[PDB]
Amino acid sequence: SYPIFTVRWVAVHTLAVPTIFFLGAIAAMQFIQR
Amino acid sequence: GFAWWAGNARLINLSGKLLGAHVAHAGLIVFWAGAMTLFELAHFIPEKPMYEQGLILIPHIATLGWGVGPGGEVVDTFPFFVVGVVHLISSAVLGFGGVYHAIRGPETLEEYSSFFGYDWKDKNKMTTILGFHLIVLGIGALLLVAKAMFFGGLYDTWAPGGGDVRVITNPTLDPRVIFGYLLKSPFGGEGWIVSVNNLEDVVGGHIWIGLICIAGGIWHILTTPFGWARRAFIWSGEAYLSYSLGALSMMGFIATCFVWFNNTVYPSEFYGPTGPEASQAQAMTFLIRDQKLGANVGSAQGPTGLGKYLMRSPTGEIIFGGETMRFWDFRGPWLEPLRGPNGLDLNKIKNDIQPWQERRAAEYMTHAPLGSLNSVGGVATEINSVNFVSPRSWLATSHFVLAFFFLVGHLWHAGRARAAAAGFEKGIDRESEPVLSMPSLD
Amino acid sequence: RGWFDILDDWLKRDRFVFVGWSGILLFPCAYLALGGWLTGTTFVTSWYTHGLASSYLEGCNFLTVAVSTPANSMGHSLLLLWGPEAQGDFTRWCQLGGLWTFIALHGAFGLIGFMLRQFEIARLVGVRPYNAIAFSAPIAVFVSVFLIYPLGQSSWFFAPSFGVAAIFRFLLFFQGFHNWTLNPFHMMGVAGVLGGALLCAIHGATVENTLFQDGEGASTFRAFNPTQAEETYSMVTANRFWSQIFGIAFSNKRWLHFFMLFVPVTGLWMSAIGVVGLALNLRSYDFISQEIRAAEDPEFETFYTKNLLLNEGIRAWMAPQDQPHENFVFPEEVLPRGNAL
Amino acid sequence: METLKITVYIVVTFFVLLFVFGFLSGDPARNPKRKD
Amino acid sequence: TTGERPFSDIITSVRYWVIHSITIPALFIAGWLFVSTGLAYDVFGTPRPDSYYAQEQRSIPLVTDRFEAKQQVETFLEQLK
Amino acid sequence: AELTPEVLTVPLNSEGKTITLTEKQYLEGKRLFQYACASCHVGGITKTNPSLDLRTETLALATPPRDNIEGLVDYMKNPTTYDGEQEIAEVHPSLRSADIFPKMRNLTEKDLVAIAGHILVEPKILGDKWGGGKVYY
Amino acid sequence: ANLWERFCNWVTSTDNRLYVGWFGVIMIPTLLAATICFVIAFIAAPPVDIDGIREPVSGSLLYGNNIITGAVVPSSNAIGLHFYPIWEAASLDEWLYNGGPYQLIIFHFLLGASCYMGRQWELSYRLGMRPWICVAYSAPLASAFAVFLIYPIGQGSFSDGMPLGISGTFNFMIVFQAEHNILMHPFHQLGVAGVFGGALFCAMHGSLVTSSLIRETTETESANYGYKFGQEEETYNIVAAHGYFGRLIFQYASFNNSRSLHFFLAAWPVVGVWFTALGISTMAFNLNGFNFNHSVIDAKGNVINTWADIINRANLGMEVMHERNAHNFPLDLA
Ligand code: CLA
Ligand code: CLA
């Protein structure tokens, strides 16, 4: 008996979800050549 | 009583596990010496000066006379490879002994053998271990004398002809010279022992130091500390570590200045020019350039009233002008042919500069030990293009940092050792707080 | 038991991150300021406002990436997304500097929210609100530097841009143009920050080195108990030590910890005031007596005159690239330069 | 000047010897707990 | 101590990692694509390496009007078509 | 803007013939210029004689003309002063002096062309920065 | 009862209002020599030819300076790193022109300040304290060694050591930026973090303790009279301060252990300032800040400026103006 979805759950995913996406976009960028 | 983050302090009285820690760490050192050499050799290109290539170990080997010929021209790479391999291989034996003694060997030694066991507080056993290591160190210093005198000599940047490997036949034994260095001022124009500028003196000093160290090793095996020494020191493992942290810190600062200033045992052919060298080389360069154009460099007054190319030092020696006036203590083999007894000689300057000297000065000027942390060569306002930071900047900065922290480590451990020896390293006894039994100050 | 009370109940529940009424202002605005800065520094340029690249996408690294200020031509426009400048075009909004105002304004309302949170939690817990009070110092700095300073100038363009090296550029600008190091209000801030850092270190070290022996272990941390009545270190021995080493010491733990609040807070407040002056170009640029003497006496030189030559260098050498809207063209022959360099 | 040099060499040697011999005079024992 | 589930107990749990070994890579790949497709350039207006200047141009296309600024950058972008 | 063939097109000789480099040759030449020449000629200046630069107009007024692949390849073999009156191989890197300038040892004939090409292309891209010094940094 | 032993007892006595000690025996003369020379020089020294170009800089009050512009000026570049005691000058007039007093002051100060640090160990031992307060002071001390000794050694001249004055300080830090790009150096960035963070945690700790003082007083008296020097009970409620601060962030970002908290207070600004002193000490050997000048170029190869290029334009204007008469050749290599 613990909740799964909390205010806590929301603040965490507020930050972590776009962090990864952002990390992926920045990884892709190391291979851009001019 | 120690936490995980001070967990190596759990080894203080486990002489066997502590042996393994030391010998395993010794393996790490030999591993890096070997691995780093092979990395440098794998990346080495002979047609490029070493100091355009970020090499710090090949230059130490070359300096011992291996792999190089006249000019520091690299002649044979195999000695480098050999040095790397033998170190790398030797680290497995030390790794083996270390993990054995740290994990499976007897935790403590003094029950297995009364020879290898020790108590930190046993002043006679400690001076005996000290003695053995002094002898080893003395042997090591003599190994360098043997190389220089009997197995091919050493690289001599001052060898007539641009530099070459030269066997040292007459090492300096005169103690007025050898110990004279130890009494010269550490300030400019003097340079304490950093000013040693010929290999005769280098080799002779290692003769003295080898004998001194062997002598003291025997001394300390045979004696016990006298009472004034017993009453002045703290006798514990931490105290002894603190003493050596202090000694290593002082040695690190010396090494820093050695590699920044000295171009004899760090030849500029391998390490690049010193800061002062590079700065002298720039004034040399434009003096050459301007004189070819017709300028009379001796009579040319610069904006300040001081000579544009040449001026006097405060003791009168004719020296290079501009800001490099600060570096007139510089001595280098490309420059000395121009010096007479009053300093730089105007008639040699007008008449006797050689192309090889023009070349060397342009080369050193453009390889001054200035560079960014990301290895962009030159002044800090320079654009990207040249991938270059001098080995001397890398060696000077790294060892200043390590020297500093070992001084912090000395203070840390010396204070702790004193407080643990007196019994208050863990805090003040509430029921016996010294200050509360002292009279008030006011 | 009306609904306002029900929501108060819910806002003020004890949970891993407290929410509060202040959370309604704080959390959206904090997240949006922070999100705007990560968004602009990853993807958004400064080409059209500044002539600069400024995102990871363009090849900048963490030191050079920035959310740059709007073009000088925008004046002090709020640069609302729906405003007459961007006319609702997200893309144009980004290219005109809209994320700068986005970040600065949501940041300002987050700061308020955060300080209201310090007030709200302190009232619910029953402690005095000195941590909110102390936080007035960061607020003063933020408003005066990011808001007041450029509002006194021609445009937002001249505020700090939100980036590591852009901030370094801001420091250098203030030296060349405002001679900001000469300003006594900055000097008091310097003393407040440096004296803060000293107090922080000397108080920490003193406590750790006048500890009572309350446990048997060599790690002294284990022998504290957050609910013990007893002081964990000796104020008495601490006071004799510092009286004998430095001549004076603290004797009063309350005064000491108030002084620790007082010093860095005041210092920041003083610097804020000086930047308000610079909003109006009201600088301490010069000493009149020095300039009169130096104009008349070409042998008179001080560190004050040496530093203004450097300011003069800075301005002429950075102005054309740093203010592209001015179309400064300085031919080589007008650039100030010493000999040879 | 040479009189000044002499004087300073002397004063300095004096203080440095006070320091060396002071710490040689059983400094570990001058604490409040365990004296040796 | 407040009633949410301890973090140490979530990130060691088998259920946790069953989801997040999908959700983490998907987001990392979603972000990749955002760049590799070119979409990031278009959403944000960010110049590509080939489109800061026109071929014989060395003028920055600096905005210089407040209320005509939108039209200005649109002009500079046709000067590259 | 991009590295179009028109920018990669440089004079081959004084006659007026021309040659179009590839991107490959250009970047080849840039790399080799950093290896062998930038220690003194970073950005088209000459750190040990700032009065002589690598701008196209300067090379053009050199004796013999050096604003072309032929003149530059020759210069790298047998460098002369600006008026052509004396050979300066003893103090300037050159294939003629690769014994004293070791970095020239492994430069091949096409390497020389890529280096000369870089020198003539870069002013077309960078403008007055090339050879202009810190004023234009 | 013997003479030497009674002297030793007074030197190391815990009963002197100010502790002397064996470190004190060197500290006191050297700091008196440095203090006295500084005060006299600041008021009345004549101008000093710092840069060795027969261009003397006026540093003292009687030669037309105020408190903000005055300084003891560094010794002459013509001297470099040569030792220049008084007795090496033909006369005091020469010693003054060439900047003798700077050398006297910095060597006496760095000595006395090193002994200051040792004196901190010593009295700690005489009082039964733990010993590492002196380790915290090594951070400021290392910083003073860097700007007065290390940077001169690496650049080859005390003329490039930090002036002893307010505007001289600024001159030093502007020239440093042009020659080393110190802003873009990670060790300086850690100094700022150590110093901003230090002032932050100072304010935090003071506001938290102050927020949780236990009511011992009335509204008409200073709260400070609620604590009596030497009382055994702690004077604030740490659980209340933990309870507020952990809810201001979350529980586990807050300290309930006062020992860890105060050790944190000590280590953050100390370590940051070690690194920034290490910054000056390694830029002394010209391992400079990150250089990203022209690091971004476009498809054709046009340079696309960043904020680092703007910093460079400002550094360039510092470079070309500083010591405007001292350079005859195109590169400022030290
Ligand atoms: C130079 C680095 C170094 C070395 C040599 C040691 C050595 C040692 N430590 Mg210390 N330690 C270090 C760094 C180091 N430590 C650091 C950085 C920390 C901070 C986290 C600690 C924290 C720490 C704690 C907390 C404790 C020690 C303890 C010990 C001792 C017992 C360890 C043991 O039984 O492990 C058992 C470990 C294993 C069985 C795992 C395998 C380990 C092997 C050796 C890995 C090596 C692999 C290698 C590739 C093999 C090469 C083989 C080939 C050459 C034949 C041992 C002598 C302990 C002690 O004092 O005991 C009384 C102890 O309690 N250490
Ligand atoms: C300084 C490092 C050091 C020290 C003090 C010791 C000390 C000890 N070891 Mg350890 N050991 C070490 C290194 C060290 N060892 C290394 C490097 C290895 C791997 C080769 C081992 C492997 C090892 C094993 C496998 C065992 C020990 C054991 C022992 C104990 C008995 C020694 C004895 O009677 O040997 C007999 C002595 C000899 C045979 C003489 C050896 C002569 C050596 C090899 C030549 C030395 C020359 C020179 C100094 C080396 C440098 C050469 C190099 C530069 C190329 C003793 C406490 C034993 C023990 O305690 O078990 C319970 C045991 O079983 N050791």
Ligand code: CLA
């Ligand atoms: C690793 C090296 C090492 C170490 C750690 C020791 C350690 C020790 N030695 Mg041994 N010693 C060594 C090498 C070493 N020795 C060698 C090679 C020799 C042969 C010369 C000796 C000869 C020797 C003798 C003859 C004696 C000792 C004694 C002692 C003990 C007292 C040391 C002491 O009080 O010094 C502290 C030193 C002083 C109080 C005076 C030193 C003042 C100098 C001038 C300071 C200079 C520092 C300066 C900043 C640097 C520049 C150097 C300068 C010359 C230019 C101690 C156990 C004593 C003892 O008890 O023996 C049983 C003793 O009488 N040692």
Ligand code: CLA
């Ligand atoms: C010969 C060198 C030497 C030796 C043998 C010791 C030995 C010891 N020290 Mg001392 N120490 C030293 C040097 C040394 N120290 C130096 C130079 C300093 C100055 C900073 C200190 C400062 C110091 C403190 C403050 C303390 C000790 C303590 C201790 C004890 C436990 C240490 C431990 O377990 O750490 C375990 C190891 C760790 C926790 C990890 C440390 C990791 C470092 C900080 C990171 C370095 C990162 C690297 C440079 C770059 C990263 C690159 C990346 C790719 C990974 C042990 C007796 C403790 C003590 O007093 O016990 C009695 C203690 O509290 N030491």
Ligand code: CLA
């Ligand atoms: C409380 C949280 C909060 C706060 C304080 C702000 C504050 C701000 N935002 Mg941000 N924003 C937020 C949340 C917040 N935002 C959220 C959750 C999002 C995601 C959707 C955004 C997205 C966002 C964007 C995209 C932008 C802003 C902008 C702004 C600024 C201008 C706001 C404005 O003009 O309002 C005007 C409107 C009001 C003040 C509302 C007043 C409400 C009245 C009292 C009631 C009227 C009721 C109605 C008429 C009755 C019915 C009518 C009939 C049809 C039935 C300002 C700094 C702009 C900015 O930063 O500019 C650069 C901008 O471009 N915000």
Ligand SMILES: C=Cc1c(C)c2cc3nc(c4c5[nH]c(cc6nc(cc1[nH]2)C(C)=C6CC)c(C)c5C(=O)[C@@H]4C(=O)OC)[C@@H](CCC(=O)OC/C=C(\C)CCC[C@H](C)CCC[C@H](C)CCCC(C)C)[C@@H]3C
């Ligand atoms: C650069 C230095 C600096 C930083 C980064 C900083 C940061 C902080 N200080 C805080 C607190 C404090 N600061 C204090 C005193 C001080 N703080 C100082 C200096 C700083 N303080 C100084 C010198 C002092 C001494 C007086 C106190 C007394 C407190 C606290 O009580 C509080 C705390 O809890 O600390 C433990 C925190 C407030 C959290 C918050 O508002 O969340 C909400 C976040 C919001 C509202 C978003 C703000 C958005 C900002 C304003 C604009 C955008 C910024 C970009 C996203 C990032 C740009 C990065 C580039 C510039 C490189 C935060 C960690």
Ligand SMILES: CC1=CCCC(C)(C)C1/C=C/C(C)=C/C=C/C(C)=C/C=C/C=C(C)/C=C/C=C(C)/C=C/C1=C(C)CCCC1(C)C
């Ligand atoms: C003791 C301990 C307990 C707690 C944890 C901690 C890890 C810190 C710890 C410390 C462990 C330590 C430091 C471990 C030491 C291990 C060491 C030094 C390992 C050394 C291994 C060396 C080996 C095999 C070398 C292999 C060499 C080979 C084939 C050479 C082959 C080669 C040759 C011959 C010609 C050139 C090419 C090539 C392929 C390289």
Ligand SMILES: CC1=CCCC(C)(C)C1/C=C/C(C)=C/C=C/C(C)=C/C=C/C=C(C)/C=C/C=C(C)/C=C/C1=C(C)CCCC1(C)C
């Ligand atoms: C080998 C070589 C190669 C190149 C040329 C050269 C000729 C120079 C050459 C020769 C070099 C030679 C022979 C080097 C000699 C080095 C010598 C003798 C080093 C001297 C070391 C002495 C030192 C530190 C003494 C430190 C003393 C300290 C702690 C005293 C501390 C104490 C004091 C002061 C009071 C009481 C308490 C306590 C703690 C004992």
Ligand SMILES: CC1=CCCC(C)(C)C1/C=C/C(C)=C/C=C/C(C)=C/C=C/C=C(C)/C=C/C=C(C)/C=C/C1=C(C)CCCC1(C)C
């Ligand atoms: C480098 C390093 C050393 C220490 C260790 C460590 C592992 C931490 C490490 C690595 C850390 C790294 C590289 C961290 C990188 C994290 C990054 C890139 C995270 C990015 C998070 C981005 C987020 C939320 C973006 C949120 C964006 C939002 C709201 C934007 C909102 C909006 C905007 C901006 C305009 C209006 C419309 C809308 C939607 C309202």
